Design a binder for these strands. Structure first.
Ligand SMILES: [Cl-]
Ligand SMILES: [Cl-]
Ligand SMILES: [Cl-]
Ligand SMILES: [Cl-]
Ligand SMILES: [K+]
Ligand SMILES: [Mg+2]
Ligand SMILES: [Mg+2]
Ligand SMILES: [Mg+2]
Ligand SMILES: [Mg+2]
Ligand SMILES: [Mg+2]
Ligand SMILES: [Mg+2]
Ligand SMILES: [Mg+2]
Ligand SMILES: [Mg+2]
Ligand SMILES: [Mg+2]
Ligand SMILES: [Mg+2]
Ligand SMILES: [Mg+2]
Ligand SMILES: [Mg+2]
Ligand SMILES: [Mg+2]
Ligand SMILES: [Mg+2]
Ligand SMILES: [Mg+2]
Ligand SMILES: [Mg+2]
Ligand SMILES: [Mg+2]
Ligand SMILES: [Mg+2]
Ligand SMILES: [Mg+2]
Ligand SMILES: [Mg+2]
Ligand code: NA
Ligand code: NA
Ligand code: NA
Ligand code: NA
Ligand code: NA
Ligand code: NA
Ligand code: NA
Ligand code: NA
Ligand code: NA
Ligand code: NA
Lengths: 237, 194, 92, 56
RNA sequence: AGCUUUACUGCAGGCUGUCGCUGAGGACUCUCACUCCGGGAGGAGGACACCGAUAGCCGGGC
RNA sequence: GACUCGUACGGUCACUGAAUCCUGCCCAGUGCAGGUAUCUGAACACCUCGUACAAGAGGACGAAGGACCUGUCAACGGCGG
RNA sequence: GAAACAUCUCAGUAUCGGGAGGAACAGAAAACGCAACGUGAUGUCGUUAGUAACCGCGAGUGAACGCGAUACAGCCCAAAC
């Protein structure tokens, strides 16, 4: 047969790449020798093409201009702070240690100083729960309990743009426009609609998968399709 | 009496014990951060170098080369192949790493010529060899009765034609009798069967 | 069929009739050092191994008689042609 | 649209041109590589053994 | 010839044990290689992982 | 190296195919996944035999996997005499 | 090709990568082993011989020592001091 679509993906051709050259900023937390002296003022609220959520343009005392992962509430004029001593209000960023338990946080770091990794999608937010001299348990938006180094920096508040998922796309055109600004090939042709040569589900005089859909984790690329290492399927039971 | 050299040599008979061990555990840290080919002012194994033709004089150069450990880095077949030729994993190359090292070095010094080379250890994923090269054009060598031979036109790119010592051993030319029927005078003259 | 564990018959060694004892030939064990054992290791490589890639064939409906005839006098055994027999049991 | 005659009409693009090195009209002005002598790709001149019968 | 599969035989790939890198005091501590985060100070991890070698299993992805 | 100037309101892999009323029963087989007293399960090292060595024979230990058990059908499919 | 075909064969061929010279390569024994009280660097030619050896012991594959010739040529380091 021929390589399946998932295999064409990896090659990184234009079709599968994201329009990076059209992206505004690689949102990442600022650095500070220490102290926390850093602070700036929101100048504008822009649209971020890579996340379909707003990003805030901020100006710091050291005249540094950078875009930030805008939580909800932040407006132009507002002043934000970054450091071990920053205030405990929405928009400010400080290590999990200096953050009071029970406070919604976003754009959490996985490794202190990595600039943020977790919870940075529209409306989501993490939840700092347990403190310690070593571990800072945080509940990520997926429900998992992530144990983290208390030195990992994070932003207070929930990410802006919440509720985006509530309104349906309604029409293909709308999807089309969104998909065009992402690293994704769209629309999607069903495997079962292809020829055997093209996909393990292809072929037949009627459309149905050849074998069962749940595939072993050990399956090789070219054959891993359908329900990957499913612990279960269906809704029942 | 023993020579000073004899001690360097005796220490390298067991690069895993004694001071040499502690020494390697150290150097390699720096080596793993160096390039593919690093010219070095002095041979790490003086006895070996001199023994192999080295000589503290103008026109004599030395460089340490690192090559990855393991079998061939081969691509699987993209057309019809009988089961015999469908291999990838177990296939190994017919030139030993030391010979690969000599070549990468010689290519780094286009004007020089490989005189010899020797192993200086290996970590878990690579091997290091120090190659002794010679400037066939420097008069300091054109006048050396022990090395001027390398200046002859027919010694040009000698490493790429397997005229090196490691080259000739890898070509199965060590034995002069039994077992060397398909090797001498040359692999190619013997229909490539060695 | 039934068969006497012992009985008189010609002993090719003594050149005279003696009382022999019948026993079923127990398979000897392999050394794994015969020439064929070496060639298997030698010749087996990447991909199909030719003959060494085959697997044992089936069986015949009935096997022949695989017996050793031991001479009670000189204690030496001898072999004979066998004969198809679904089952063979010795009497005593 | 026919892949034949009707698709011939759009062919007004220039690719292969006289080669500064070998003089053959094989210099792909978009690739900046000569399909004939390999100029632009190789310092050595393009030549393969299959350009003639194996025993010649 | 293309295609399929619980056809024959193999080949990638995945999982797994073992050896090398690899070090100090059947479960455990450690730091020094090695890995990663950090501009750096330095933080996390740590003889594991990665990588090289081998063995068993799965293996029409080829 | 793509995904990714991305981080679960994400994006990957599949099935179905707007709305509306709905979507029953079956986990035996096959698939996937979880577990597992016990059984099975390669090589290195280890023990025994063997060989002044070696080939080789046997043992002990036993990973994933399998047996066995469980979950799962908007998983492949099934819904008769 | 093996009257299929997988080892084998085609064949280390076709083709690809790198490089020298007017020739290249080889070369002064940790050789040979007509076992000797023998030969004496290396290529090459004739022979040894379709012999020994390999091989679903199938089809096929296939040397060497020696011998007769051609031409002959033997040296330099490392170390000891
Ligand atoms: Cl979407
Ligand atoms: Cl050279
Ligand atoms: Cl019997
Ligand atoms: Cl002789
Ligand atoms: K063939
Ligand atoms: Mg696109
Ligand atoms: Mg980023
Ligand atoms: Mg949706
Ligand atoms: Mg579709
Ligand atoms: Mg169709
Ligand atoms: Mg297929
Ligand atoms: Mg349908
Ligand atoms: Mg269907
Ligand atoms: Mg020749
Ligand atoms: Mg095999
Ligand atoms: Mg056409
Ligand atoms: Mg056919
Ligand atoms: Mg990095
Ligand atoms: Mg097939
Ligand atoms: Mg449709
Ligand atoms: Mg045939
Ligand atoms: Mg036949
Ligand atoms: Mg042959
Ligand atoms: Mg001989
Ligand atoms: Mg002298
Ligand atoms: Na189908
Ligand atoms: Na050179
Ligand atoms: Na050979
Ligand atoms: Na062999
Ligand atoms: Na076809
Ligand atoms: Na079932
Ligand atoms: Na089941
Ligand atoms: Na035929
Ligand atoms: Na055929
Ligand atoms: Na064969």
């Amino acid at each position: 047969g021929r390589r399946i679509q998932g295999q064409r993906r990896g090659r990184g051709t234009s079709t599968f790449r994201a329009p990076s050259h059209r992206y505004k900023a690689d949102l990442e937390h600022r650095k500070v020798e220490d102290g926390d002296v850093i602070a700036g003022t929101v100048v504008d609220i822009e649209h971020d093409p890579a996340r379909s959520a707003p990003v805030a343009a901020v100006e710091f005392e050291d005249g540094d201009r950078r875009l930030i992962l805008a939580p909800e509430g932040v407006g132009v004029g507002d002043e934000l702070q970054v450091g071990v001593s920053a205030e405990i209000a929405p928009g400010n960023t400080l290590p999990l240690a200096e953050i009071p338990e029970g406070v919604p946080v976003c754009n959490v770091e996985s490794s202190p100083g990595d600039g943020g990794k977790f919870a940075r999608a529209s409306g989501v937010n993490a939840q700092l729960l347990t403190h310690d001299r070593n571990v800072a348990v945080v509940k990520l938006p997926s429900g998992e309990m992530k144990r983290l180094d208390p030195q990992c920096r994070a932003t207070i508040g929930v990410v802006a743009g919440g509720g985006r998922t509530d309104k349906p796309f309604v029409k293909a055109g709308n999807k089309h426009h969104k998909m065009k600004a992402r690293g994704t090939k769209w629309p999607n042709v069903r495997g079962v609609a292809m020829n055997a040569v093209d996909h393990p589900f292809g072929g037949g005089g009627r459309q149905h998968p050849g074998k069962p859909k749940s595939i072993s984790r050990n399956a090789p690329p070219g054959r891993k399709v359908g329900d990957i290492a499913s612990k279960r399927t269906g809704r029942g039971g | 009496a023993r020579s000073a050299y004899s001690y360097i040599r005796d220490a390298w008979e067991n690069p895993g014990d004694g001071q040499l061990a502690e020494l390697q555990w150290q150097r390699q840290q720096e080596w793993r951060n160096e390039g593919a080919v690093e010219r070095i002012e002095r041979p790490t194994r003086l006895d070996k170098a001199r023994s192999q033709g080295y000589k503290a004089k103008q026109g004599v150069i030395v460089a340490r080369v690192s090559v990855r450990k393991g079998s061939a880095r081969k691509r699987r077949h993209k057309a019809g192949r009988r089961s015999k030729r469908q291999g990838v994993t177990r296939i190994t190359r017919r030139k030993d790493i030391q010979r690969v090292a000599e070549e990468r070095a010689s290519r780094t010094f286009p004007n020089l010529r490989v005189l010899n080379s020797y192993s200086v250890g290996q970590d878990g994923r690579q091997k290091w060899h120090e190659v002794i090269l010679i400037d066939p054009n420097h008069p300091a060598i054109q006048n050396d009765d022990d090395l001027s031979w390398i200046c002859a036109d027919d010694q040009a790119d000698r490493v790429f034609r397997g005229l090196t010592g490691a080259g000739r051993r890898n070509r199965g030319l060590s034995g002069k009798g039994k077992g060397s029927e398909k090797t001498r005078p040359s692999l190619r003259s013997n229909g490539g069967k060695g | 069929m039934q068969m006497p564990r012992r009985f008189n018959t010609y002993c090719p060694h003594c050149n005279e009739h003696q009382e022999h004892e019948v026993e079923k030939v127990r398979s000897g064990r392999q050394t794994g050092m015969k020439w064929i054992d070496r060639q298997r290791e030698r010749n087996s490589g990447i991909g199909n191994d030719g003959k060494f890639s085959k697997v044992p064939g089936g069986d015949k409906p009935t096997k022949k008689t695989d017996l050793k005839y031991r001479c009670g006098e000189c204690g030496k055994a001898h072999l004979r042609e066998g004969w198809r027999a679904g089952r063979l049991e010795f009497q005593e | 649209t026919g892949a034949g005659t009707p698709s011939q009409g759009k062919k007004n693009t220039t690719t292969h041109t006289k080669c500064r090195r070998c003089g053959e009209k094989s210099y792909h002005t978009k690739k900046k590589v000569c399909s004939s002598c390999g100029f632009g790709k190789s310092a050595k001149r393009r030549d393969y053994e299959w350009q003639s019968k194996a025993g010649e």
